């Protein structure tokens, strides 16, 4: 039975960035 | 043949890649593999217990098994490997542990309630915290008052009574928050 419970989690939107990440060391 | 004949596998909180991973070694096993939770599923692979499927079947599917994420690939590997796989299927090996992160901390519970609490949390695969810290995810509270709970209201994290704790091992899942809150 393929009635849907709950939906598969959704691929998240690529998103605006808005923070870039000190230089790793 | 096809050791997992008549099951059916989803997951929820796994990495795309090792989602991958599991749904094709799964199928090579026997196994459907669904992306939705249907109604069908019978084993649920968890990476976390804070999601939509998880609580629905925490909530409302006692019968589906809640899966840690190495159950598929350590099971390949043992019949890749030619070994010979009782009925078990290594299913009870590798149940996701009750509190799997769960970090529990307690105010207003005397002694040895405490001691008692702590002993149980380990030994379900959470994480006891003496201190309320931000990423505290159960806060146990003996009555609604202290500087423990009012700083667990202020940083949203669950305050529950100690019966969500019994009734979490219990039924061998994370039960939802509100289902225990006080008064
Ligand atoms: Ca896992
Ligand atoms: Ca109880």
């Known amino acids: 039975y393929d009635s849907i419970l709950v939906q598969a989690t959704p691929r998240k939107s690529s998103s605006v960035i808005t923070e870039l990440p000190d230089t790793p060391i | 043949s096809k050791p997992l004949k008549g099951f059916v596998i989803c997951c929820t909180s796994?990495?795309?890649?090792?989602?991958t991973e599991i749904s094709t070694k799964a199928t090579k096993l026997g196994a459907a593999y669904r992306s939705?939770?249907?109604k069908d599923v019978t084993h649920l692979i968890a990476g976390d217990?804070?999601?939509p499927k998880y609580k629905f079947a925490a909530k409302?599917?006692?019968?589906?098994?809640?899966?840690?994420?190495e159950w598929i690939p350590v099971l390949y590997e043992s019949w890749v490997q030619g070994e010979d796989?009782?009925?078990?299927?290594?299913?009870?090996?590798?149940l996701l542990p009750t509190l799997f992160k769960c970090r529990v901390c307690l105010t207003?519970?005397?002694?040895?309630?405490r001691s008692r609490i702590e002993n149980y949390v380990?030994?379900?695969?959470?994480?006891?915290?003496?201190?309320?810290?931000?990423?505290?995810?159960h806060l146990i509270a003996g009555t609604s008052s202290g500087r423990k709970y009012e700083y667990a209201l202020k940083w949203k994290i669950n305050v529950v009574c100690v019966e969500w704790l019994w009734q979490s091992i219990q039924r061998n899942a994370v039960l939802e928050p509100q289902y225990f809150q006080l008064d």
């Open chain 2, 85 to 94: 796989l009782d009925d078990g299927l290594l299913v009870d090996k590798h």
């Open chain 2, 108 to 113: 207003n519970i005397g002694q040895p309630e």
């Open chain 2, 49 to 51: 217990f804070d999601t």
């Open chain 2, 60 to 69: 409302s599917r006692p019968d589906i098994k809640i899966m840690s994420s």
């Open chain 2, 36 to 38: 939705d939770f249907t």
């Open chain 2, 14 to 19: 796994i990495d795309l890649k090792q989602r």
């Open chain 2, 122 to 137: 380990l030994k379900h695969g959470g994480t006891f915290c003496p201190d309320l810290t931000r990423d505290v995810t």
